[PDB]
Short mmCIF file of C-alpha atoms in Angstrom, two decimals:
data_model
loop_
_atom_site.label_atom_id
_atom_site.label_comp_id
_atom_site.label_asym_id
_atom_site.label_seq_id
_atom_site.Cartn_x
_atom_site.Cartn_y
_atom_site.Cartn_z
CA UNK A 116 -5.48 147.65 296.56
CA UNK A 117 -6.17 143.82 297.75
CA UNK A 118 -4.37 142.29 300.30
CA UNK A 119 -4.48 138.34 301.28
CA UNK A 120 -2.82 137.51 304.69
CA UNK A 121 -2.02 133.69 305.02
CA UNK A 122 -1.63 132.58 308.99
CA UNK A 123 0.27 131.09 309.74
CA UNK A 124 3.15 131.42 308.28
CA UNK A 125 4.69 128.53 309.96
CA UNK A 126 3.34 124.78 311.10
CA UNK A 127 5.63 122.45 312.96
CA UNK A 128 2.75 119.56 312.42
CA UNK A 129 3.32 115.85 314.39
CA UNK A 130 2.19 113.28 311.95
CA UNK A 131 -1.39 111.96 312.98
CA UNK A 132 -2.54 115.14 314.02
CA UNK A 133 -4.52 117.45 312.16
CA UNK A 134 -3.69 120.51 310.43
CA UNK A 135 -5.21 123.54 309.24
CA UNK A 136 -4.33 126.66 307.11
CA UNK A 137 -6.07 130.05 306.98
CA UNK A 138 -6.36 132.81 304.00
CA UNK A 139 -7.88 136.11 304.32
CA UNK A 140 -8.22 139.14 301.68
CA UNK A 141 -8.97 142.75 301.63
CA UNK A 142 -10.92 142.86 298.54
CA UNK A 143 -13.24 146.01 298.42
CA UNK A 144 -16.11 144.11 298.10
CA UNK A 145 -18.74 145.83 295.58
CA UNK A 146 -21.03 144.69 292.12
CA UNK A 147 -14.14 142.41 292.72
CA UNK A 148 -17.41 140.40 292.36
CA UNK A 149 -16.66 137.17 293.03
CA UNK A 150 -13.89 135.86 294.75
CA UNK A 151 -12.22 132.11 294.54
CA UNK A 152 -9.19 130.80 296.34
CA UNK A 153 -7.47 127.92 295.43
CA UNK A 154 -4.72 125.85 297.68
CA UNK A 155 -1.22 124.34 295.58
CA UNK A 156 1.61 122.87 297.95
CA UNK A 157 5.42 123.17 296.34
CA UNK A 158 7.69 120.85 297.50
CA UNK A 159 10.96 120.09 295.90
CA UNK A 160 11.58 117.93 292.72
CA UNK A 161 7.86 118.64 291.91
CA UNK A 162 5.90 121.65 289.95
CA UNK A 163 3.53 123.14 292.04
CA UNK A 164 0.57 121.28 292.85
CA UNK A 165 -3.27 122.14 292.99
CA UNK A 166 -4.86 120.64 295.87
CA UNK A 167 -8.03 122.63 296.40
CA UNK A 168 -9.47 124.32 293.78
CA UNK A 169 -12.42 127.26 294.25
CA UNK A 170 -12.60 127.12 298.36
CA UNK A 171 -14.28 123.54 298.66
CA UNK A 172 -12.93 120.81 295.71
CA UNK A 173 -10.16 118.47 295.28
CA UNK A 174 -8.00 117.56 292.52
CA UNK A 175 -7.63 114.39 291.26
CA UNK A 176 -5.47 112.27 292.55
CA UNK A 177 -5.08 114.36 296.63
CA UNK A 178 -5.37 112.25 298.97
CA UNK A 179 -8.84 112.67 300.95
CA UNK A 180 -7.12 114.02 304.26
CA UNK A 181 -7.36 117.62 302.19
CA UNK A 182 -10.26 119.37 302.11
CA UNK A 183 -11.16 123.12 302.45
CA UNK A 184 -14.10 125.43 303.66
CA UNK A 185 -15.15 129.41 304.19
CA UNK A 186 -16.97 131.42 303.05
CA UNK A 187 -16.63 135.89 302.00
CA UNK A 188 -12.83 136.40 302.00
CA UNK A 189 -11.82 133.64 304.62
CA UNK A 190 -11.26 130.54 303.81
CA UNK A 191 -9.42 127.15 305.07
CA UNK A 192 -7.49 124.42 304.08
CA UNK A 193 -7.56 121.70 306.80
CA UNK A 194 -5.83 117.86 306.76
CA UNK A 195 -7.64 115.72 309.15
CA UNK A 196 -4.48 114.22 309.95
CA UNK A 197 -0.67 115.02 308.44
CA UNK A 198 1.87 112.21 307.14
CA UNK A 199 5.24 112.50 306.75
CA UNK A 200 4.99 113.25 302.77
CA UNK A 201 2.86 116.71 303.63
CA UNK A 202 5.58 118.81 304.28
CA UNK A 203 6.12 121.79 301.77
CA UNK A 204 5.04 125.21 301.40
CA UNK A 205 1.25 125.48 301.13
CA UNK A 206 0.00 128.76 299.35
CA UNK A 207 -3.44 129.92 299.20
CA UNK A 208 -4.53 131.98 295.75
CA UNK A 209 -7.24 134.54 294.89
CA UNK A 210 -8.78 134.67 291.37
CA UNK A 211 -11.30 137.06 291.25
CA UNK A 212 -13.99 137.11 288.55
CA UNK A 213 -15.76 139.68 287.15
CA UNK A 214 -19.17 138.58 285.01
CA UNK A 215 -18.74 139.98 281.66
CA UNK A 216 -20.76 143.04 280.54
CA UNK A 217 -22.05 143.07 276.95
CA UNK A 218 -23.18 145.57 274.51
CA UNK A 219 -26.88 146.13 273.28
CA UNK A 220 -26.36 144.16 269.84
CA UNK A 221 -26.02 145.71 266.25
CA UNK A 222 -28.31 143.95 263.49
CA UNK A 223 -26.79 143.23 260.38
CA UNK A 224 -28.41 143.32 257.53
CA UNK A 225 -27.98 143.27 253.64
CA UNK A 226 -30.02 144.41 250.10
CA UNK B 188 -21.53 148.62 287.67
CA UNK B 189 -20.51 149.18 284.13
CA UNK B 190 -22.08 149.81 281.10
CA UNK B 191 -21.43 149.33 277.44
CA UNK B 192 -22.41 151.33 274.49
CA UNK B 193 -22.43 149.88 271.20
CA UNK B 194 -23.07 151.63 267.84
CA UNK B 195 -25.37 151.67 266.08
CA UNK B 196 -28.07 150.00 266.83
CA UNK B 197 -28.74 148.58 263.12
CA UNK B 198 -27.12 148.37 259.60
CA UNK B 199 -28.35 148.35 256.41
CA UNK B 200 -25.81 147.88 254.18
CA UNK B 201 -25.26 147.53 250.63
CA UNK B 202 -23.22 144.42 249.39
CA UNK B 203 -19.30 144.71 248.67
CA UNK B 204 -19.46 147.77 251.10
CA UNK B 205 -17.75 148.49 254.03
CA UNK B 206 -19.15 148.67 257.74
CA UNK B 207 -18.19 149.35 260.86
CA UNK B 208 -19.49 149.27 264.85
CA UNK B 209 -18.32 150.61 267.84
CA UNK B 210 -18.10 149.86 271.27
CA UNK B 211 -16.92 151.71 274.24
CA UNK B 212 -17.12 151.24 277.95
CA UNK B 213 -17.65 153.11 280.77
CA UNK B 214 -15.11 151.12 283.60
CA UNK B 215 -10.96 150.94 290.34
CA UNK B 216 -9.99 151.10 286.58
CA UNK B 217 -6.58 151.00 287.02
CA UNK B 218 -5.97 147.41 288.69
CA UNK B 219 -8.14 146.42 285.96
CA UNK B 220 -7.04 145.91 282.16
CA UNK B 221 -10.73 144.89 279.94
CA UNK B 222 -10.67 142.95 277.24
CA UNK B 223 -13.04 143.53 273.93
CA UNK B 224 -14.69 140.53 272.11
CA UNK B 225 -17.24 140.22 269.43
CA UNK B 226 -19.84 137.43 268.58
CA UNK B 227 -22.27 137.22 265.65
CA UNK B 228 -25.46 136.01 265.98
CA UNK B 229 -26.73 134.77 262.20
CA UNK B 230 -30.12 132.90 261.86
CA UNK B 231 -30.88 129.99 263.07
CA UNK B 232 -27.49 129.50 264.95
CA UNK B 233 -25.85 130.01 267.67
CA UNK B 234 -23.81 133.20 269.07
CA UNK B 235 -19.89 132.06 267.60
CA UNK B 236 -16.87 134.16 268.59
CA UNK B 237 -15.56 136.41 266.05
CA UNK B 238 -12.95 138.95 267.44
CA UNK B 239 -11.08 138.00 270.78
CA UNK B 240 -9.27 140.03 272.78
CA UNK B 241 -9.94 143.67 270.29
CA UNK B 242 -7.79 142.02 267.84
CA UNK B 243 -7.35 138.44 267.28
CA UNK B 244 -9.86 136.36 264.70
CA UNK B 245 -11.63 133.39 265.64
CA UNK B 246 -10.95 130.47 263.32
CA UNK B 247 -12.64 130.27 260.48
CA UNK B 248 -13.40 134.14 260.57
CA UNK B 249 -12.66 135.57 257.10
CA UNK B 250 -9.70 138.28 257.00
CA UNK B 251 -12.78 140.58 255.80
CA UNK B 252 -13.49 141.13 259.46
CA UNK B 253 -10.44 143.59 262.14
CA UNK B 254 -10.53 145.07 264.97
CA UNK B 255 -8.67 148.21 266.83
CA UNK B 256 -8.87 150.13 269.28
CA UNK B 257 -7.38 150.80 272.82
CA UNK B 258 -8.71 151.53 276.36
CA UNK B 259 -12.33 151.35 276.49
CA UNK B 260 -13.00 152.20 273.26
CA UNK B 261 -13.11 149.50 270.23
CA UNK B 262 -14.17 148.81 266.77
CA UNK B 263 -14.68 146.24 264.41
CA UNK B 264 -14.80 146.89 260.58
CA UNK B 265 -15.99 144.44 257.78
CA UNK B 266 -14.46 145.36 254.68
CA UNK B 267 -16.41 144.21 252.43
CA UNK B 268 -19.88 142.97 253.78
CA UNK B 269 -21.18 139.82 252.14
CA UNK B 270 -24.42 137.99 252.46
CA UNK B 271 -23.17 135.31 254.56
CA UNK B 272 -22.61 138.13 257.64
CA UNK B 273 -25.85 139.16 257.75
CA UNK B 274 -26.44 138.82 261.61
CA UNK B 275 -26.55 140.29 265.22
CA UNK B 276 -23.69 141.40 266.35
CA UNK B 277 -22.31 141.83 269.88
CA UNK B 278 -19.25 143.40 271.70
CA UNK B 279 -18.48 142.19 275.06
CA UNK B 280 -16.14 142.88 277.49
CA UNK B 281 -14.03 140.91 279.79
CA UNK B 282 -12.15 142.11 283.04
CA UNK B 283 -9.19 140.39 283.87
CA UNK B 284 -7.32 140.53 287.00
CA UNK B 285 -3.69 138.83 287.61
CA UNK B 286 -4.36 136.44 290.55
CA UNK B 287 -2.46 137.69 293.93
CA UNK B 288 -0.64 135.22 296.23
CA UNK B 289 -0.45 134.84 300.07
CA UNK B 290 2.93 134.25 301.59
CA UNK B 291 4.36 130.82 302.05
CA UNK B 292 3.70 128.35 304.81
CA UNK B 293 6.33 126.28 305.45
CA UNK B 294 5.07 122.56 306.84
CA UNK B 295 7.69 120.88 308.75
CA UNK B 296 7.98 117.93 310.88
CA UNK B 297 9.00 118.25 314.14
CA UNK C 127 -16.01 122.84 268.85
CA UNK C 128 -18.58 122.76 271.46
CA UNK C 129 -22.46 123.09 270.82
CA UNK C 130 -25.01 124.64 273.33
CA UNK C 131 -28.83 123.67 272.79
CA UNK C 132 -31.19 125.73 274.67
CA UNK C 133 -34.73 124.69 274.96
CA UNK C 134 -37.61 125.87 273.98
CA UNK C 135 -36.99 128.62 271.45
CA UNK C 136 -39.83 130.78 272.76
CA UNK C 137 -41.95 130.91 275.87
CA UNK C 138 -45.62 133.02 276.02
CA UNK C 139 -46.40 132.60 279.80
CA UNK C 140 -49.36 133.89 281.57
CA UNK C 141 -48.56 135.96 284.25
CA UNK C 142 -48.60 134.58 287.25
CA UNK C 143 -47.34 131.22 286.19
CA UNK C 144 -44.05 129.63 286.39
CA UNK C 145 -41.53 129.44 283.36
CA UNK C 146 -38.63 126.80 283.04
CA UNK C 147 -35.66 126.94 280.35
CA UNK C 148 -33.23 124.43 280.15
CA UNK C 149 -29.72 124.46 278.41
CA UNK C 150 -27.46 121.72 277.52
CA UNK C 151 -23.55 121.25 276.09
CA UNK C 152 -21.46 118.82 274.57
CA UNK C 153 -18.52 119.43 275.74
CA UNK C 154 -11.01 116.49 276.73
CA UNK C 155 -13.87 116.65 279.02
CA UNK C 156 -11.93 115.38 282.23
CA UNK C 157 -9.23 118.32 282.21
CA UNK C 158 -12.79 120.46 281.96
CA UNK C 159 -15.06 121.73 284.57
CA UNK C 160 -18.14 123.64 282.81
CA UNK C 161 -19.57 126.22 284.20
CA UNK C 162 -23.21 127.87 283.40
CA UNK C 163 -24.21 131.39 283.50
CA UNK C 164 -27.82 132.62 282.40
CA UNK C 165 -28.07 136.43 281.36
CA UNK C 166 -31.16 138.14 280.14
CA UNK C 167 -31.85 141.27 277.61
CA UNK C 168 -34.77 142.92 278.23
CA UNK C 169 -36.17 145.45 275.66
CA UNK C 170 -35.02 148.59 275.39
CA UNK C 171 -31.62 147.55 277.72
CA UNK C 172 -28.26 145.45 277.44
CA UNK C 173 -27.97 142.12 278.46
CA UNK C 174 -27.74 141.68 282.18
CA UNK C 175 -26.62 138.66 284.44
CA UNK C 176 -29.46 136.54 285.98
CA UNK C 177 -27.67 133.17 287.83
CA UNK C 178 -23.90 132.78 288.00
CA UNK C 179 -22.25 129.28 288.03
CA UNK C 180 -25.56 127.58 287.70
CA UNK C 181 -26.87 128.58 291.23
CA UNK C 182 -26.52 132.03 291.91
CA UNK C 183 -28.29 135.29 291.74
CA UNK C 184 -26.97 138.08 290.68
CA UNK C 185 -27.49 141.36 292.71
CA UNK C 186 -30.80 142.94 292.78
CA UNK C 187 -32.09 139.52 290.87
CA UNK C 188 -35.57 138.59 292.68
CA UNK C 189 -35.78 135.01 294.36
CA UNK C 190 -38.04 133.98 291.77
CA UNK C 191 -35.18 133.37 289.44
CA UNK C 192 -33.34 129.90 290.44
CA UNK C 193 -31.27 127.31 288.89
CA UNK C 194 -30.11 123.79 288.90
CA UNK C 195 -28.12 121.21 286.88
CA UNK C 196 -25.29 119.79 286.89
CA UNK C 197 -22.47 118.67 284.41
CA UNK C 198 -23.59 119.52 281.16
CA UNK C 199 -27.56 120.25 281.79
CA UNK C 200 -28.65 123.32 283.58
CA UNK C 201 -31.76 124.59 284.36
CA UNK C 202 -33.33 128.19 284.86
CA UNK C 203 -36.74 128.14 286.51
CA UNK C 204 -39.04 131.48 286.51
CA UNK C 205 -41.60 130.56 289.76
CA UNK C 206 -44.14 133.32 289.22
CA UNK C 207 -43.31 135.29 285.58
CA UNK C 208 -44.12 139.20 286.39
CA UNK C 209 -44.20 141.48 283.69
CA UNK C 210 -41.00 142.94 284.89
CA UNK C 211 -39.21 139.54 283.56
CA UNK C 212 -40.38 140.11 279.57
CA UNK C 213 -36.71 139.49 277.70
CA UNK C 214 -34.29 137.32 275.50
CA UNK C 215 -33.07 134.79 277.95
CA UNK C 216 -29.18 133.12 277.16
CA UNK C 217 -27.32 130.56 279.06
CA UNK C 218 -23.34 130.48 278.81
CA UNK C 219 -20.93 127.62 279.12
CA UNK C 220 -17.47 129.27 280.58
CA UNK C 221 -14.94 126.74 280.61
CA UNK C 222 -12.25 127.07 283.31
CA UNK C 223 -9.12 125.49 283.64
CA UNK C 224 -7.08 125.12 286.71
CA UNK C 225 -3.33 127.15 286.00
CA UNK C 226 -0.48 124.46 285.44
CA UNK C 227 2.70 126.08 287.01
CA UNK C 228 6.73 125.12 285.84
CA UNK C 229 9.47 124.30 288.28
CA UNK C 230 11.35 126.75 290.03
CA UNK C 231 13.93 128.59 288.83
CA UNK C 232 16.61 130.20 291.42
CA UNK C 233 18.30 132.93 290.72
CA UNK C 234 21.12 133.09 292.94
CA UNK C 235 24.47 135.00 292.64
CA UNK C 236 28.11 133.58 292.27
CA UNK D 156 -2.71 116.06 280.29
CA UNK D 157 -0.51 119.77 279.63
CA UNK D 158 3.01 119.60 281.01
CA UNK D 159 5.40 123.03 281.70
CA UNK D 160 9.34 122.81 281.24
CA UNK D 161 10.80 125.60 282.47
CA UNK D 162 14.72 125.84 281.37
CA UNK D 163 17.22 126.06 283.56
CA UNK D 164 15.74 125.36 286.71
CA UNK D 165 18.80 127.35 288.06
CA UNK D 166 20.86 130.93 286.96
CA UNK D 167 24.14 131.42 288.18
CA UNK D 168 24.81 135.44 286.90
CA UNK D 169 26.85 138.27 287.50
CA UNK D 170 25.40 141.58 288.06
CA UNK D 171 25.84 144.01 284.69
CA UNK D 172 25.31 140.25 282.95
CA UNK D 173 21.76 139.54 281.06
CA UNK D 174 19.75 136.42 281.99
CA UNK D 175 17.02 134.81 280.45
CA UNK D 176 14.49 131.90 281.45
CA UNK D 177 12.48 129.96 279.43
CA UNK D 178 8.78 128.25 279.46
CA UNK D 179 7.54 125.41 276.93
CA UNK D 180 4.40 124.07 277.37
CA UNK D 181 2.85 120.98 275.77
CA UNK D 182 -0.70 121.90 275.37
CA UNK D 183 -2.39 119.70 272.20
CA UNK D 184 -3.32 122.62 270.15
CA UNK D 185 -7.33 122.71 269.00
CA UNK D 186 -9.95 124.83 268.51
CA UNK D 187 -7.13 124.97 275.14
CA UNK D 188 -7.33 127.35 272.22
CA UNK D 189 -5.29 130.36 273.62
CA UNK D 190 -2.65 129.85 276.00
CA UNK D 191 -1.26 132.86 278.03
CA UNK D 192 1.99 132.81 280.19
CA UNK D 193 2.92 134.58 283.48
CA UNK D 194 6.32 135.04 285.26
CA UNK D 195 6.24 135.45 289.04
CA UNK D 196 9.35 136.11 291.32
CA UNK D 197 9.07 134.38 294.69
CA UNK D 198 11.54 136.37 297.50
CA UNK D 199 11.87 135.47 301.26
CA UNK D 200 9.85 138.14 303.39
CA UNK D 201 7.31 139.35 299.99
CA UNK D 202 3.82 137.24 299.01
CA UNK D 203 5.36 135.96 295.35
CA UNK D 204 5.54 139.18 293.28
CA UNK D 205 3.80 139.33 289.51
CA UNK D 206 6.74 140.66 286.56
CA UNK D 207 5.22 139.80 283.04
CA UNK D 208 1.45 139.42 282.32
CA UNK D 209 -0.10 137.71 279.08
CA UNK D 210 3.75 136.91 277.92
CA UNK D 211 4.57 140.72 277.26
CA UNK D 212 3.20 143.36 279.66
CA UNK D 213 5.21 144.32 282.87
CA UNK D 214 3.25 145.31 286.05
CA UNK D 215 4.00 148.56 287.80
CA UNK D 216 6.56 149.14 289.81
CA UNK D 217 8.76 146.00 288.58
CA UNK D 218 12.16 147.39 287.01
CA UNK D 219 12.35 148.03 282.92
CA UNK D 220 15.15 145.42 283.14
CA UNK D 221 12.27 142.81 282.96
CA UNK D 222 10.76 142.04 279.48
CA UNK D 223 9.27 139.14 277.76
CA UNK D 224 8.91 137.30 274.39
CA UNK D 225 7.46 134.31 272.81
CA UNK D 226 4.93 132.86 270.79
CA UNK D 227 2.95 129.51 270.82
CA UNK D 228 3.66 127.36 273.61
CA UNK D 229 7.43 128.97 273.79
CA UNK D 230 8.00 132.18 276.20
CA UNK D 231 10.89 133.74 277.55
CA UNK D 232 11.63 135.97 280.78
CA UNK D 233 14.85 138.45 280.16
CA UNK D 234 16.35 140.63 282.07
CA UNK D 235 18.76 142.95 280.51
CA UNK D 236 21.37 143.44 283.00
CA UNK D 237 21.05 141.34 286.67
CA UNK D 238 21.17 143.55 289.83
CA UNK D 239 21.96 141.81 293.00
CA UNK D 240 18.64 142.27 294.62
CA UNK D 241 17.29 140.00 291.83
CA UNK D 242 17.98 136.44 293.37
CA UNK D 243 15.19 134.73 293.76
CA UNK D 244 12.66 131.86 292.64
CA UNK D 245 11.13 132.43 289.01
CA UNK D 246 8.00 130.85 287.89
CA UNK D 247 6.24 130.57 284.83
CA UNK D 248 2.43 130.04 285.09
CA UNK D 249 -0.19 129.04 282.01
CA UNK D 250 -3.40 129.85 281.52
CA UNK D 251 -5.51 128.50 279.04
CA UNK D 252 -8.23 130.42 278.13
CA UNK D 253 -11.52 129.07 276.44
CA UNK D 254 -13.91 131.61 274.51
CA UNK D 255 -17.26 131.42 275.64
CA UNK D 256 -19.82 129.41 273.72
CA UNK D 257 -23.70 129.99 274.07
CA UNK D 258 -27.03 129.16 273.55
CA UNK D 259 -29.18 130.50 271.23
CA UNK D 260 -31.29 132.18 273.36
CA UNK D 261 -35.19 132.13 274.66
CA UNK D 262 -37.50 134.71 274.40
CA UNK D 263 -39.98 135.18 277.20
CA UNK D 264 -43.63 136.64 275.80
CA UNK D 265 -46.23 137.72 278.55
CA UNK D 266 -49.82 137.91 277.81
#
């Protein structure tokens, strides 16, 4: 049906140096509609965290060395240069919206 | 696309009665589930929510006001139509889909 | 509650001539990111989407249709109304909200 | 803000033996408004894998073993009897919904 392909799957990252994470989907594209992705890292003795949130925006609180771009069904999440504290497991995540479709109306009305 | 079909298109209804509209849709509709609301539209204000999700009332909506249905196909009935629900009234539908994951990437240090 | 005021009530345009609609909310606003859609019924027909998430068209939606805003205020601008564009215009706040996620829990087998 | 407990954050079971996992979630009732939960099951070698939608529906293809339960801010995973193939990380995920709220609309005359 949709299929999202996250490369790679592995980063052996030397702190300084930049780093960069790619998603990709299969969605049939047609009228989903719209697709988002957003980027969480889990590391251990945390929840998950949001760090990029509809391709391009930051939570609160990241530090600035995230940041993401793309465009379609590819899209990146790229730190300009890793620290010790980044490791984890990064996961990328597709929401896809539909607009909602409405009805013609019924009027109401009383004696 | 996809295209709703709400009935009918106007009521005139006698108070203390009973009424009742009907919407059904037209959604690769199986990794899709839709969801049915309804908003009233009375004079001078605002659309508000009244039915969410083919079943649930907004607050504040009187217990006069239900919904069923299944699928595509949904209805809500006033029981007893009173003067303060004179309005337009609207069915929309929402498509949800579950949010899919990519596989890990494990960040180490080397 | 949240209250949407969309301004003016009624437009009569001159073909030709450029139309402009503006929409504002009053929406604990920090955990909130509002977004604006702007749908249209024409006569005769549902309602339709026009501009999604403030800025963009919807499919088949001419150029002439555009938006801007930011926050809370949004704006729809018409450049050239065409007799094609006669219609009920709507804005719609959706309010998202990133998905908060627990701890682990492994499973594992003794 | 919203915080998520999820209880325990580990399951030691027995195959034949039932397990259940719990999700609380602190959300100052108002008016989000409606608050859905998700479970998830993340294995080595799959993408994570979806198990109970909207706090009650199973997706296809995931054993009957899996149900769920709840109401409010309280929902619970079960699984009637473990099978070995079942170890694995187990997330709960909220979503808070908000109704939509509109204007009161415009309409556009020509002369």
């Amino acid at each position: 049906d949709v299929v999202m392909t996250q490369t790679p799957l592995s980063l052996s990252v030397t702190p300084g140096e930049p780093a960069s994470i790619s998603c990709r989907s299969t969605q049939s594209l047609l009228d989903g509609v719209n697709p988002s992705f957003d980027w969480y890292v889990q590391k251990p003795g945390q929840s998950p965290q949001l760090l990029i949130h509809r391709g391009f925006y930051r939570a609160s609180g990241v530090p600035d060395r995230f940041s993401g771009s793309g465009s379609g069904t590819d899209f990146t999440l790229r730190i300009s240069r890793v620290e010790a504290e980044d490791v984890g497991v990064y996961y990328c995540m597709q929401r896809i919206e539909f607009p909602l479709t409405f009805g013609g109306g019924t009027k109401v009305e009383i004696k």
